[PDB]
Design an enzyme around this catalytic site. Structure first.
Site, mmCIF file in Angstrom:
data_model
loop_
_atom_site.group_PDB
_atom_site.id
_atom_site.type_symbol
_atom_site.label_atom_id
_atom_site.label_comp_id
_atom_site.label_asym_id
_atom_site.label_seq_id
_atom_site.Cartn_x
_atom_site.Cartn_y
_atom_site.Cartn_z
ATOM 1 N N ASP A 1 29.125 -92.689 -21.658
ATOM 2 C CA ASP A 1 29.974 -93.010 -20.517
ATOM 3 C C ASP A 1 31.204 -93.797 -20.982
ATOM 4 O OD1 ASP A 1 30.104 -93.070 -17.407
ATOM 5 O OD2 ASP A 1 30.478 -95.154 -17.930
ATOM 6 N N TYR B 1 38.830 -98.830 -20.090
ATOM 7 C CA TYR B 1 38.041 -99.691 -20.987
ATOM 8 C C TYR B 1 38.751 -100.006 -22.297
ATOM 9 C CZ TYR B 1 34.163 -98.275 -17.894
ATOM 10 O OH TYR B 1 33.370 -97.992 -16.807
ATOM 11 N N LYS C 1 36.662 -91.306 -16.751
ATOM 12 C CA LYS C 1 37.067 -91.631 -15.387
ATOM 13 C C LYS C 1 38.592 -91.729 -15.272
ATOM 14 C CE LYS C 1 32.909 -94.621 -15.305
ATOM 15 N NZ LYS C 1 32.974 -95.271 -16.654
ATOM 16 N N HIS D 1 37.574 -93.086 -10.568
ATOM 17 C CA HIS D 1 37.044 -94.447 -10.783
ATOM 18 C C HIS D 1 36.877 -95.259 -9.491
ATOM 19 C CE1 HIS D 1 36.531 -97.211 -14.516
ATOM 20 N NE2 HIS D 1 35.743 -97.643 -13.547
HETATM 21 N N1 LIG Z 1 32.217 -96.946 -12.484
HETATM 22 C C1 LIG Z 1 32.462 -98.249 -12.624
HETATM 23 O O1 LIG Z 1 33.297 -98.956 -11.747
HETATM 24 C C2 LIG Z 1 31.821 -99.044 -13.713
HETATM 25 C C3 LIG Z 1 31.749 -100.428 -13.545
HETATM 26 C C4 LIG Z 1 30.960 -101.189 -14.407
HETATM 27 C C5 LIG Z 1 30.260 -100.560 -15.430
HETATM 28 N N2 LIG Z 1 30.352 -99.212 -15.611
HETATM 29 C C6 LIG Z 1 29.630 -98.529 -16.719
HETATM 30 O O2 LIG Z 1 28.270 -98.919 -16.819
HETATM 31 C C7 LIG Z 1 27.986 -99.414 -18.117
HETATM 32 C C8 LIG Z 1 26.858 -100.437 -18.086
HETATM 33 O O3 LIG Z 1 27.129 -101.506 -17.219
HETATM 34 P P1 LIG Z 1 27.627 -102.942 -17.772
HETATM 35 O O4 LIG Z 1 28.293 -102.788 -19.081
HETATM 36 O O5 LIG Z 1 28.402 -103.579 -16.669
HETATM 37 O O6 LIG Z 1 26.292 -103.839 -17.887
HETATM 38 P P2 LIG Z 1 24.778 -103.584 -18.351
HETATM 39 O O7 LIG Z 1 24.637 -102.307 -19.076
HETATM 40 O O8 LIG Z 1 23.934 -103.732 -17.141
HETATM 41 O O9 LIG Z 1 24.532 -104.833 -19.347
HETATM 42 C C9 LIG Z 1 25.312 -105.010 -20.517
HETATM 43 C C10 LIG Z 1 24.909 -106.373 -21.091
HETATM 44 O O10 LIG Z 1 23.503 -106.461 -21.327
HETATM 45 C C11 LIG Z 1 23.229 -106.600 -22.713
HETATM 46 N N3 LIG Z 1 22.081 -105.741 -23.127
HETATM 47 C C12 LIG Z 1 22.066 -104.399 -23.422
HETATM 48 N N4 LIG Z 1 20.802 -104.019 -23.731
HETATM 49 C C13 LIG Z 1 20.005 -105.105 -23.614
HETATM 50 C C14 LIG Z 1 18.648 -105.306 -23.821
HETATM 51 N N5 LIG Z 1 17.885 -104.279 -24.187
HETATM 52 N N6 LIG Z 1 18.084 -106.571 -23.630
HETATM 53 C C15 LIG Z 1 18.880 -107.630 -23.246
HETATM 54 N N7 LIG Z 1 20.234 -107.436 -23.060
HETATM 55 C C16 LIG Z 1 20.789 -106.193 -23.233
HETATM 56 C C17 LIG Z 1 24.522 -106.294 -23.435
HETATM 57 O O11 LIG Z 1 24.568 -107.075 -24.609
HETATM 58 P P3 LIG Z 1 25.009 -106.496 -26.049
HETATM 59 O O12 LIG Z 1 25.967 -105.341 -25.875
HETATM 60 O O13 LIG Z 1 25.692 -107.657 -26.737
HETATM 61 O O14 LIG Z 1 23.802 -105.980 -26.811
HETATM 62 C C18 LIG Z 1 25.572 -106.704 -22.417
HETATM 63 O O15 LIG Z 1 25.751 -108.111 -22.378
HETATM 64 C C19 LIG Z 1 29.336 -99.932 -18.604
HETATM 65 O O16 LIG Z 1 29.433 -100.043 -19.997
HETATM 66 C C20 LIG Z 1 30.256 -98.872 -18.064
HETATM 67 O O17 LIG Z 1 30.150 -97.762 -18.916
HETATM 68 C C21 LIG Z 1 31.118 -98.444 -14.757
HETATM 69 C C1 LIG Z 2 38.362 -103.139 -18.152
HETATM 70 O O1 LIG Z 2 38.796 -103.289 -16.799
HETATM 71 C C2 LIG Z 2 38.010 -103.911 -15.860
HETATM 72 C C3 LIG Z 2 38.179 -105.259 -15.537
HETATM 73 C C4 LIG Z 2 37.364 -105.863 -14.569
HETATM 74 C C5 LIG Z 2 36.366 -105.136 -13.908
HETATM 75 C C6 LIG Z 2 35.467 -105.727 -12.888
HETATM 76 C C7 LIG Z 2 34.656 -106.945 -13.138
HETATM 77 S S1 LIG Z 2 34.706 -107.845 -14.618
HETATM 78 C C8 LIG Z 2 33.552 -109.004 -14.044
HETATM 79 O O2 LIG Z 2 33.152 -109.991 -14.753
HETATM 80 N N1 LIG Z 2 33.141 -108.747 -12.794
HETATM 81 C C9 LIG Z 2 32.236 -109.524 -12.124
HETATM 82 C C10 LIG Z 2 32.663 -110.447 -11.248
HETATM 83 O O3 LIG Z 2 33.889 -110.593 -11.058
HETATM 84 O O4 LIG Z 2 31.826 -111.145 -10.641
HETATM 85 C C11 LIG Z 2 33.699 -107.651 -12.248
HETATM 86 O O5 LIG Z 2 33.433 -107.239 -11.066
HETATM 87 C C12 LIG Z 2 36.161 -103.792 -14.202
HETATM 88 C C13 LIG Z 2 36.949 -103.145 -15.154
HETATM 89 O O6 LIG Z 2 36.757 -101.823 -15.440
HETATM 90 C C14 LIG Z 2 36.188 -100.962 -14.452
HETATM 91 C C15 LIG Z 2 34.772 -100.692 -14.883
HETATM 92 O O7 LIG Z 2 34.057 -101.658 -15.212
HETATM 93 O O8 LIG Z 2 34.379 -99.515 -14.925
#
Ligand SMILES: NC(=O)c1ccc[n+]([C@@H]2O[C@H](COP(=O)([O-])OP(=O)(O)OC[C@H]3O[C@@H](n4cnc5c(N)ncnc54)[C@H](OP(=O)(O)O)[C@@H]3O)[C@@H](O)[C@H]2O)c1
Ligand SMILES: COc1ccc(/C=C2\SC(=O)N(CC(=O)O)C2=O)cc1OCC(=O)O
Length: 325
Positions: A45, A50, A80, A113
């Site tokens: 993804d 990003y 996206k 997005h």
């Molecule tokens: N469509 C959208 O608006 C949007 C918004 C937000 C996110 N996303 C997508 O969703 C993906 C995932 O969500 P996210 O990055 O927000 O958060 P997440 O995947 O829920 O969590 C990421 C965090 O958890 C840690 N982590 C990963 N595996 C772990 C494990 N097995 N045990 C403990 N900690 C672990 C990572 O640390 P380390 O990396 O340091 O290991 C990082 O700090 C994003 O990368 C992005 O691709 C899309």
């Molecule tokens: C790299 O550009 C980005 C910058 C900020 C965001 C949104 C954030 S970053 C963050 O710490 N939080 C949590 C919060 O504000 O409580 C958000 O809701 C999201 C962004 O990308 C969209 C995505 O995450 O897919």
């Protein structure tokens, strides 16, 4: 492929586990991509916003394609379309830039997005005098039609929606010649999205859970808000199953047939995050996890305006999160 899949309405198989890449920086993401592919990930993804697609692209060129370690047809790549690129004229150039950076000939999935648009141009966060966001009023229905032309050009195999509400989904469906295949939203035991998931099932959209681990290292966290990975019920199940809290969170979702894209750069966590298809929760354990639902949304776009940290878009008439779902 280490993960099992779900079948999209297009006929595509989408692995139930993909590697998230938000906050995976240039200088680390290349290693993360290569490790993930090597241990069996076949779903990445990505997003233009990003800031790392150029580096992701170098990894894919080394590792994926003819004469390489992974065949392109076996890999599922999502990107996206960012908010500034909602104008029908800007859709194709935005996608072609993403393809160039990723060094790919096509995406498997391209998502809108957000439903709302930002001012056209090369500032991803265009701002007014007062420092608030400068919006553009292109309707998401016009953007959708322009995204459809990309499927006709062989540039994207499937289209979908990110951060759309049920009404906005239904609005897209009323004009869709190419049907959205996936909705990507925040989802985890604190925000179960049960109603939105049911809504998607009825309309043929598979659901991808972003922030499936509670995005625990997100910027500007409320110290009073709970940490999902520290949840007692989760820690209890982790003990019982001899697995990590993160594996419990991911298992819950893939057991529901919800696609998860956990982000990690840590090789050990990358590996463990895809190892979630070898155990099953009882109906009672599923019920314990379902009981945690509490409408707690961690990902809300934020801004710094005049010394205070404020919701970026919460007041916009097209903001998705105002409806009940
Ligand atoms: N469509 C959208 O608006 C949007 C918004 C937000 C996110 N996303 C997508 O969703 C993906 C995932 O969500 P996210 O990055 O927000 O958060 P997440 O995947 O829920 O969590 C990421 C965090 O958890 C840690 N982590 C990963 N595996 C772990 C494990 N097995 N045990 C403990 N900690 C672990 C990572 O640390 P380390 O990396 O340091 O290991 C990082 O700090 C994003 O990368 C992005 O691709 C899309
Ligand atoms: C790299 O550009 C980005 C910058 C900020 C965001 C949104 C954030 S970053 C963050 O710490 N939080 C949590 C919060 O504000 O409580 C958000 O809701 C999201 C962004 O990308 C969209 C995505 O995450 O897919």
């Amino acid at each position: 492929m280490a993960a099992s899949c779900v079948l999209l309405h297009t006929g595509q198989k989408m692995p139930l586990i993909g590697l998230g890449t938000w906050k995976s920086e240039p200088g680390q993401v290349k290693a993360a991509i290569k490790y993930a592919l090597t241990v069996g990930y076949r779903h990445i993804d990505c997003a233009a916003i990003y800031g790392n697609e150029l580096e992701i692209g170098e990894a894919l060129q080394e590792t994926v394609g003819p004469g390489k370690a992974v065949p392109r047809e076996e890999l599922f790549v999502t990107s996206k379309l960012w908010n500034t690129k909602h104008h029908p004229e800007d859709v194709e150039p935005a996608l072609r830039k993403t393809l160039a950076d990723l060094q790919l000939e096509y995406l498997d999935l391209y998502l809108m997005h957000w439903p709302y648009a930002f001012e056209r141009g090369d500032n991803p966060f265009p701002k007014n005098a007062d420092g608030t966001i400068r919006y553009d009023a292109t309707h998401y229905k016009d953007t959708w039609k322009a995204l459809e032309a990309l499927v006709a050009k062989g540039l994207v195999r499937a289209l979908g929606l990110s951060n759309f509400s049920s009404r906005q989904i239904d609005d897209v469906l009323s004009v869709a010649s190419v049907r959205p295949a996936v909705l990507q939203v925040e989802c985890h035991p604190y925000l179960a999205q049960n109603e939105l998931i049911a809504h998607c099932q009825a309309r043929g959209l598979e659901v991808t859970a972003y922030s499936p681990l509670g995005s625990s290292d997100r910027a500007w966290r409320d110290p009073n808000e709970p940490v999902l990975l520290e949840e007692p019920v989760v820690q209890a199940l982790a003990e019982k199953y001899n697995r990590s809290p993160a594996q419990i969170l991911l298992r819950w979702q893939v057991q529901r047939k919800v696609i998860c894209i956990p982000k990690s750069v840590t090789p050990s966590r990358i590996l463990q995050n895809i190892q979630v298809f070898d155990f099953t929760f009882s109906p009672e354990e599923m019920k314990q996890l379902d009981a945690l639902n509490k409408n707690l949304r961690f990902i809300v776009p934020m801004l710094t305006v005049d010394g205070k940290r404020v919701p970026r878009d919460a007041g916009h008439p097209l903001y998705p999160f105002n409806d009940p779902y």
